[model samples]
Target chain A: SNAMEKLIVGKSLEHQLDTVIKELAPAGNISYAVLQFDDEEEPTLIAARGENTVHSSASLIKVLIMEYVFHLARTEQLDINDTVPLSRTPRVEGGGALQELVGKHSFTYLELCRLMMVLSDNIATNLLITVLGMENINARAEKLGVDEMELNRMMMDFNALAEGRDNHITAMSLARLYKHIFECRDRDVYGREMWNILGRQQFRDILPFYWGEGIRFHHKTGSLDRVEHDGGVIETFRGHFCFILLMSDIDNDRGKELGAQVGRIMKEFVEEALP
Target chain B: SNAMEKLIVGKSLEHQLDTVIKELAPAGNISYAVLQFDDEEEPTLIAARGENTVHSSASLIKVLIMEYVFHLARTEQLDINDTVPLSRTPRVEGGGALQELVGKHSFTYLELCRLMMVLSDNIATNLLITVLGMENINARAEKLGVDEMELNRMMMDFNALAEGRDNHITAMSLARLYKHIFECRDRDVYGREMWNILGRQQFRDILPFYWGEGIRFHHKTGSLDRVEHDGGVIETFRGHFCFILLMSDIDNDRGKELGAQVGRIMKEFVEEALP
Candidate 1:
């Protein structure tokens, strides 16, 4: 149950992860939390700085939405290759970048996955949320043993969610979801076909640009002015690590830089010391 | 009249333009159109291909919005440094590209002049539109004398115009706005302050990055489909020129490339024919 501490030299590196984020993105509000999974025991929280803290998930919620889709896919509810006529209802709000292809844009389950992962497309995720229901996603997040990962509403429901914002998550819960993704990759949730697509993701090549390219990590990035968080799993030849870094009140861009900076540093620790 | 006939020389450089589009954006669709303006004379349609023509002014409509604002400023109806709070009720649609900011943003007319000219912020333009009214904008467009220019709702008034998707214009009309802005720069419509701002615009630099550094042009890029058109005053040490390259069936990125390509070719024509 606590093998992560025995295998990975945690305390010293955890402090380093904290230090780097404070320095690089001083103004960037950041929260960092990490979880690791090995074959022998339950996924372990390997010493995190901000694992339970809250932060805006941004498009990173695409994971929860995609997980719901995968749950459906695993249950034989929908086909990955089936084409979905991007009917004007969701009105084409998926892409991370803005697009107005309402009456014309369409995507297959496969394309939406690419759109979500590569572009961090919110509209695509919203469409999935609307079709599959947010409750379905929250249920999966809960079942995966996450603490409090909730898919309250569509992404950027800016005006609608202005007051209560009606959305939130904890880093440890996101870590739980990450670990479950690793465990359920082969389960009835998202079968072999979906796993192949998830594995083909190319753009998370993002971290390599800032962090090094050596680590095999499947992470999602989220941001706003004061909040930034990155939650995902990092698998090295040594082991599979489930991590979530939820950062907030960055007071500036520092929060954002720290979210990624800290997330990357956490990975560096696993790559360097963890076995 | 005769200048364009004499300058239309060389091969139909359309393929070079097309090739550039392919190289820059292989995946994105490019709906673009380009037109040349020699002076007070009518704009001559130069070359076009790919979704050869549809009709969406996109954000490029900001230029016309700017033209309208300049007209208001010239008329002393508004002050350049005036600050105005944004409103949600009489919402101005596309002010440069600051759609979200308009509801909550505030700015001095001068800052907006900068935003619309440089950042292409939609919020800034929407403020101008709200102050000046859409009718006034359409009037300026007509008075400055662009063919087929019309006002339907405000900029980015998608919810309202969604029913009447007929709100559109030809690339030729946009090309006309470039000339009109130049033509009315010093006159009564756009006085010293406004004209000076137009003359000192920063869009002149980005032309080279997209169209090759060869062309130094001041232009407004519009989009819808989105229609992509970039046209403006070009001062190449050899000659002062105004041209608009437009595309409607294209999205934003490809339209930008198309606009840039046209800018480069115009620069090529200027440099190649240098004394």
Candidate 2:
């Protein structure tokens, strides 16, 4: 018997990514999962490094909330055009514009969804969390089979944060969830709307940093003091691929440097290695 | 006579940069100038492709406004502690935060300054332009020896933009101004504060995109439909380098991709080629 357990299921694509992910391990606490999906080939898990390990989701959880909203809107259970009050009920602290606005101003569900994606607005996140109950969001995630991705608390809820209620996620679950959202975009109107909102992100410092230009990234980014996470579907000249990069307890610079290398390497893998 | 002008003047360190910049020429209508400076060595124009051709300054003009307020504070002509009102005088249409805030909420001069730098708040810009006086800002630019950069109109002023009065800049002048600010950080109190503000920019898509993380970037970004510009002093493992990237009438994606390439290439030139 070999001393090291086989970290990847047998797939030539996985071997290539495993080689690179192993080389990047020295950067810090790093984890990622990649899925190569296309019409011609079976969806392959190209690589999984700490894919099952739980980590704080940060802003990445917003996508889960976004998913639940679309679920309701598509079924005609919720009207996206219905106005929602921008109340200062909690007014949590984080990145956003809604907190600065005067009370009494209202935003439609669609408008809030746009604000959440483009700005990663904290106020918008908290509002949506209330409108879409925490239990309902968790149930939706479970139904989608992404059980490892959980929304346990509202954005910037320090008391809940102290109680160990911070949202948790696994890279595999996020990658799977994004793949679902990307595919559903073609068939579901609300799903297409969600992708459009995510694609116009104002914050492009993570995966998009190294991707350069002309590529559209329908993605979301999560940043805390020691955490940087970006997960999304990237449109490539050849085809689209779903990638999830989550890093914790790592230096920010190191995370970006390694994260960018992973993005470029993944692109090469899809282009050069995949049939 | 040599066919090519010695665009970099006398620095032997520029040969590597000239090679890469020349290779990148066919990307589009592009212009850039890089200034490499250190305390021990005289500052050198390491490379100048289109150094003198004027381009729209975009949000890059905010740094000029930031500089003038600091100059006033240093000269005891302005009080950063004084509070000013945020009125929706014209309610400009562009990127920023103060636009959503209801009018009549007064902020300290320093708060407005932070909003302007970190958020690139357009309303804060217009207010500061009036408070600092456009003529004074321009005069200070001349005093600082950056002649080719001008703040000719208020932000989002369509009347001025339509009349061909949009702010204009040359890569050479912007580069020089940044070098001045970077150097003065050690000697001038206000200068240090200016760098501190610029260092916390919330918008980090262009130059900072390729820079990765942990490396501090004292910068500002400007964007129109077809324009993308980011300028700043970047602290690298080797040393600080001042850069000014100005692009106009180029597709948004192409500008970012090309701008990022320029950043990476400059870093490589400084690390592997510079003496």
Candidate 3:
């Protein structure tokens, strides 16, 4: 390297994020993970708080569902362009306009996958699950080595709640999935598409709520009454990074605010540090 | 009579808008309309370049269609909450998520109405047209006293184009419709909802493209290959104003750029003028 990247002596990013992350952790439980790449052999894991600890997946499970659909295509199991039929029975509602369709519709797998991320479409997620069985989705997550992440329930299926079958994921696992997607984007069609689709996730009120202008959050946000989660890649003018923030047992609004505060801290440090 | 509001000498809003608008018009054809309110009896027409000159409505027709729907609701012919069935034959699609639904479905009249404006869902427009026969829609336009405006064809319906039966509206007519909506917003549910729904139209490229944070474009924008239009209310911290711009015979992007330029001039004047 031509020169070392540094700010004031001992202006360590790891230390700055460590302090802020530590400060926010005392108020509530947080499972947050981050990755820093020097454009090196592999990204550096500079922060991991309960990274392996699992929590209810919320909408976060949709990302894995999207990845598995593409994985199938990459393996020649199914085509992204192939169509998936709309269910005659009403699909799950909330978080998307798709459930408004009480009509007979079949969407291309790619369209379903895009909506699953872009709109966090509950209907799209359920339809994709049908194409790829519940067990198969979980199996793919294991193959990818994000062992802490798993999916068993359909979106908004209250009966699953009664049976105590809920989906689960962790910050580190989510971080790993994004890392794979990022590294493969250049040559892998699925990877490239995954990265592009994630950028279209327009639910920008999570960690993106506080950051302005030069910062961009290409991520999925998951929320419940008390749970809030945002995970995927973040880009600043200075560089790029991936993050996973999974929170629980706090007011959802409070959780979002806390996440934004932490996000602003990391974003500021990453942008301010020497290039 | 109310004491008139004024700024400076060249600070005449009408004169200022005229200079910018005229310079813009010579580049191509432009039909622009403006309304200023004393917050008294009615608004004053501060600027009217080709105000009554008819032009293709582009998506601007949707505003009148929206008004007609609410007009029916207010007159007891319909309830905004009432359901209107989705069409089975594939809808004319562009600028909306409704077309993705190939299922058997229907939407509440208000939902259909909202999409017609918010997303400019052509599919929603046709469904709305079905609810009120084409003949009835035209009659309501006449009833509203906008003689220069009329809709004789469906959206993206090319066969109608073959017959030269195209929808047409003018800056003044669109201005009048918004005037009705603004005046009744406080006392009429339909007007209040219409005002609220129009604000949700998020097409910002035409007039809002160049503006900054303090400005808000609560308006509808319409575009074709050579034509670009933006209409409805615009708000700044100091005050609000209504405008309608219909441009044709120019590059779409150039037209949009021109509209944004003109919009900026007006926006700056209103914000700078004494209330």
Q: Top model by DockQ, which number? A: 2
User: What is candidate 1's lDDT per residue for B1-275, written digit by digit as tens?
Assistant: 25365336422555566677677655544443444444466654545554224465555666777666666676788765567665633544332233322123455666666566654556666667667787777777777666366667555667767787444555556656666666665566354444555544433322443342233346655544445455566665545555545554454444544455556765675456422
TM-score of chain B of each: 0.70, 0.87, 0.89
Error of 1 at B134 (Å): 43
Give each model a TM-score.
Answer: 0.49, 0.64, 0.57
Which has the better DockQ: candidate 2, or candidate 3? 2
Per TM-score, the best of the predicted structures is 2
What lDDT, from 0 to 1, does candidate 3 have?
Answer: 0.73
Q: Assess candidate 1 and give its TM-score to the true structure.
A: 0.49
- Which digits, one per residue and each the tens of the lDDT, describe model 1 over residues A12-54? 6677876786677555445556556765357665676666666
Q: Which parts of model 2 are misplaced by more than 4 Å? A: A1-16, A38-42, A99-104, B1-58, B62-147, B151-167, B170-200, B204-219, B222-275
| Comparing 2 and 3 on TM-score, the stronger one | 2
Q: What tens digits encode model 3's per-residue C-alpha lDDT throughout B91-111?
A: 775546665554455678888
Sort the candidates on TM-score, descending order. Answer: 2, 3, 1
Provide the lowest-lDDT 10-residue window in model 1 chain A.
A94-103
Q: What digit string (tens of lDDT, one per residue) describes model 2 on residues A1-275? A: 11122123325545665565567655556777777656434356656678899999988988888888888899999998776777835676577766544424567777777777777888888888888789999999999999899999888888888987889998989887887887778787897888887787767666766555556788898987678888888776657777788889876655655667677777676666554
The RMSD (Cα, Å) of candidate 1 is 16.3
lDDT of residue A229 for candidate 2: 87
